[PDB]
């Protein structure tokens, strides 16, 4: 790996600089190098890894949606034939997106998840695994599409089971996991009722636990609760 010669601490430092400079591809490459040092990641380091790849894949997903929309319109009745270029370029972006997802899933499988014993790390990584299979599912149309969807579901489900046993209902990782699994149900699994039920129950159980929190924890938890509410408003 091209980061093999750089110190772990230097990779982390540069990931933070790349974030400040909004250079998210660099940030992801630095964090990949840090993961490949083989040591477990701290809470802050996990969040750097997550931020970097979320921004990279987020840009790819946005571009893929633009191109997919153009491709769909080109295949409508009365549309003029413009050749293979739209499909080719959509496929190019799609392949790059799949490559990023495969890279993240590879880091999780070699060997972040298997060494993650505390709930805060294990739930975080399993949520990420569900997220990146979900992004693969968004572009999937082949024979393995059902298996891709089930891989996302399985990772989310294991994360949910751990989070319900080991974390309070206001824990921000637990809340963000529920938010994303609910989106999986709505957008991927054709299960809007499950999506709505999960978001509502998560919101209500968090509400009932806010009284235990400091002002700073309350701010963290209510921020994500508002995202759950925003989705409920969109869906109902």
């Amino acid at each position: 790996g091209a980061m093999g010669s750089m110190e772990r601490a230097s990779l982390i430092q540069k990931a933070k600089l790349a974030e400040q400079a909004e250079r998210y591809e660099d940030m992801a490459a630095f964090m990949k190098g840090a993961v490949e040092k083989g040591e477990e990641l701290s809470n802050e380091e996990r969040n750097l890894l997550c931020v970097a790849y979320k921004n990279v894949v987020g840009g790819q997903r946005a571009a893929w949606r633009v191109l997919s929309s153009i491709e769909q319109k080109s295949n409508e009745e009365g549309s003029e034939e413009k050749g293979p270029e739209v499909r080719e370029y959509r496929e190019k972006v799609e392949t790059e997106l799949q490559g990023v997802c495969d890279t993240v899933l590879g880091l999780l499988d070699s060997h972040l998840i298997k060494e993650a014993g505390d709930a805060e790390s294990r739930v975080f990584y399993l949520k990420m695994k569900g997220d990146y299979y979900r992004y693969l599912a968004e572009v999937a149309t082949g024979d393995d599409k059902k298996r891709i969807i089930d891989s996302a579901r399985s990772a989310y489900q294991e994360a949910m089971d751990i989070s319900k046993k080991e974390m309070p209902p206001t824990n921000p990782i637990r809340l963000g996991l529920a938010l994303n699994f609910s989106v999986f149900h709505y957008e991927i699994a054709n299960s809007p009722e499950e999506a709505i039920s999960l978001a509502k129950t998560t919101f209500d159980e968090a509400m009932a636990d806010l009284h235990t929190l400091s002002e700073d924890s309350y701010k963290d938890s209510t921020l994500i609760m508002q995202l759950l509410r925003d989705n409920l408003t969109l869906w109902t």
Partner: peptide, 5 residues
């Protein structure tokens, strides 16, 4: 699109 984190 719906919110995710």
């Amino acid at each position: 699109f719906p919110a995710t984190v």
